[PDB]
Each structure stands twice: as C-alpha cells, then as structure tokens.
Design a protein that fits this description.
- The modification Cysteine sulfenic acid (-SOH) is found at residue 283.
- Ca(2+) binds at residues 137, 140, 142.
- Keywords: Calcium, Coiled coil, Metal-binding.
- This is Exopolyphosphatase.
- With 299 residues, the chain is an alpha/beta fold.
- It folds into two domains: 1-125, Nucleotidyltransferase, domain 5; 126-299, 2-Layer Sandwich (Nucleotidyltransferase, domain 5), CATH 3.30.420.
- 42% of the residues lie in helices and 23% in strands.
- The chain has helices at residues 43-46, 51-70, 90-100, 110-124, 161-168, 176-190, 205-214, 232-243, 247-253, 259-262, 265-278, 291-297; strands spanning 3-10, 14-22, 27-36, 76-80, 105-107, 131-136, 141-147, 150-157, 199-203, 229-231, 283-286.
- The strands form two sheets. It has a six-stranded mixed β-sheet with strand order 8-7-6-9-11-10, with helices on both faces.
- It binds guanosine-5',3'-tetraphosphate.
- Guanosine-5',3'-tetraphosphate (G4P) binds at residues 11-14, 36, 81, 137-138, 204-205, 290.
C-alpha cells in the first residue's frame, strides 16, 4: 500500500531531488540529492541559457531519474524557476528534458512556490488558526496567508536580500543611519501585507540558520530546528550581534553561517524582525520544509 513520491526542483543555480513515501498517514524523506549547475548563469544579460550549463543540468536530470525509477516512485513532479523564462532557449530546453530524460518540467511563479512551501508547512507543522507563512529568500520574500491546507492569498515582495543589501548597506558592517533607512523602507513596504493572523511560520535559509544559531545546533540537523520557536527577543539578539561586525567575522566565528550568506544575512534577519513588528507578534515558528517538500505534499 506504500506509495512513494519524488520532486525535482531546477533552480537558477541548483538542481534538487527528493523522494519520499506514505506509510498509512505519515510521509517521510528517504533521500535528498542536489547538484550545482548554475543554469541561471548570465541569463539576464544575454537573454540566453548557456549551452554548457544546459548540458551539465541535463546530465544531472538523467543521473536523477536513474534514482527515481529505481525506487519506482509512482508519482513524480518537477518544477523550475521562472527566472529561466527570460531565455529564448527556455522552451527548447524544456523540450530536450522531455525526450532526453523523459521528464515534464513545469515552470512556476514565485507565488506558486509560495503556495507549495505553504503546503509543506501545513503538513509538517499543522498550524492552527489563520496562518501566514513568510518565505524570505534571496530574490524576494513571499507572504502566504491561509487556513489549514487552504491558501487565502499570496503576496510576493520585490525585497530581495541581495539588492536590498546593495541599496541600504554601503559599509560592512553598515552604519546606524543605513540600518535606519533600511527599516524605514522595510516599514513602508511591509505595512502593505499587514493582516490579522494567529500564527506566523518562518521559512528559508536565513531563518533556519538563525535557529541553528539560537539552539547551538552545529552539524545541521533538521529536527533540532524544525518546529522551533523564535521570540522577537532571541531574534533581535542576533541582529544586534552581527550588525556590530563585518560579514567575514560572522563567517569565521559562527559555523552555521555560509560565507555566501555571511553578508546579506543582516537584511534577512531585519525582514523577520520588522515583520513581527508590523504583524505585532512576539514570536514565530520555524520550518525546515519548503517548496521542494511542499511539492511532494501535494499528494
Ligand atoms: N549550499 C549551497 N546552497 C546553495 C548554493 N547555491 C544556491 N544554494 C541554495 O539553493 C537555493 C538557491 O538556488 P536554487 O537551487 O537554483 O533555487 P532557486 O533558483 O529557486 O533560487 C537556495 O536554497 P534555500 O535555502 O532552500 O532557499 P534560500 O531561502 O537560501 O534562498 C540557496 O540557498 C550553493 O552554492 N551552496
């Protein structure tokens, strides 16, 4: 009676696989693989998908389906960033994947991904009352409102940690004024999503890094993190810490901080901070499950 499923997310830089199955009522992850192909390389400036990248990605996709079929998972979905939509060869690519790897890839919007992530949260955390999943990412953050497995509304804010960090922070670490204009802005933009909620669930690399931080979880374990709480205080404690030091010292002194995140992580912490303010809340619940797991959730 056991049914196994798998999901494959083709990101702008990574490709991920996740096969799982359902006993009676429980769903569990049996494997998680991921490889960097950087399929998104120079897409914006060239309006093209580099052939070698496409080549590298396709090989991995096959490498992946080898496992899918292996576990004979009778249900497989594959999605891709819409970022690749700016490439003329985007459809051509999608085509090749179809016959060369025998795989149907659905490009999805930043809102759709929000919807998927939200679903992963409804199953892994079973939130109560009105819930708002806040998925802060590198390109942008999505606020997803709903009840149970029902999605009310999804709003996607252009507030990408990278550009947001390039704009307001001109020094590493930044100056007090900079941090101030940063929050004025955050305020303006965030007041737009303000809605009455009961439980705010936190998502993304920044906030799970923050949990590991707060709970002294070094070798990353997604059980000592998932479902953990993060009061406004614990969060403000760490914003304060980092703000006082340059991206590098954060990387050096704190093992859970990925060099790639080390810098931008300030603004990321900021968003979560100001959000609790606007939504007037003392804390939020952190989730290790997101898009990749949310896709599987759908059945
Ligand atoms: N370890 C590692 N991870 C990488 C690297 N590059 C990207 N990632 C992770 O993979 C996702 C971003 O790239 P993709 O896989 O292409 O996904 P995407 O195009 O939809 O953004 C994010 O995972 P995420 O945490 O689920 O989303 P996020 O909130 O950080 O954005 C990001 O942190 C890398 O070089 N090393």
């Amino acid at each position: 009676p056991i049914m196994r499923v798998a999901s494959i997310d083709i990101g702008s830089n990574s490709v991920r696989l996740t096969i799982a199955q359902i006993k009676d009522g429980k769903l569990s992850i049996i494997l998680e693989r991921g490889r960097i192909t950087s399929l998104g390389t120079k897409v914006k400036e060239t309006g093209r998908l580099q052939e070698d990248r496409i080549e590298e990605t396709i090989q991995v996709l096959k490498e992946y389906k080898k496992l899918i079929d292996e576990f004979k998972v009778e249900r497989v979905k594959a999605v891709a960033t819409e970022a690749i939509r700016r490439a003329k060869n985007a459809e051509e690519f999608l085509e090749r994947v179809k016959r060369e790897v025998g795989l149907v890839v659905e490009v999805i919007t930043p809102e759709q991904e929000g919807r998927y992530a939200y679903l992963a949260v409804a199953y892994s955390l079973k939130p109560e009352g009105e819930v708002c999943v806040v998925d802060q990412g590198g390109g942008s953050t999505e606020y997803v409102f709903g009840k149970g497995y029902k999605v009310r509304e999804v709003i996607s804010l252009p507030i990408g940690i990278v550009n947001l960090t390039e704009t307001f922070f001109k020094q590493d670490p930044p100056t007090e004024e900079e941090v101030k204009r940063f929050f004025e802005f955050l305020e303006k933009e965030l007041s737009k999503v303000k809605k009455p909620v009961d439980t705010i669930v936190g998502l993304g690399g920044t906030i799970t890094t923050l949990a590991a931080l707060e709970y002294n979880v070094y070798p990353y374990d997604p059980q000592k993190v998932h479902g953990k709480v993060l009061t406004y205080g614990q969060i403000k404690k760490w914003f304060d810490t980092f703000k006082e030091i340059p991206s590098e010292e954060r990387s050096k002194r704190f093992r859970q901080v990925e060099d790639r995140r080390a810098k931008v992580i300030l603004a990321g912490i900021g968003i979560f901070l100001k959000t609790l303010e606007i939504f007037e809340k003392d804390c939020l619940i952190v989730s290790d499950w997101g898009l990749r797991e949310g896709v599987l959730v759908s059945e």
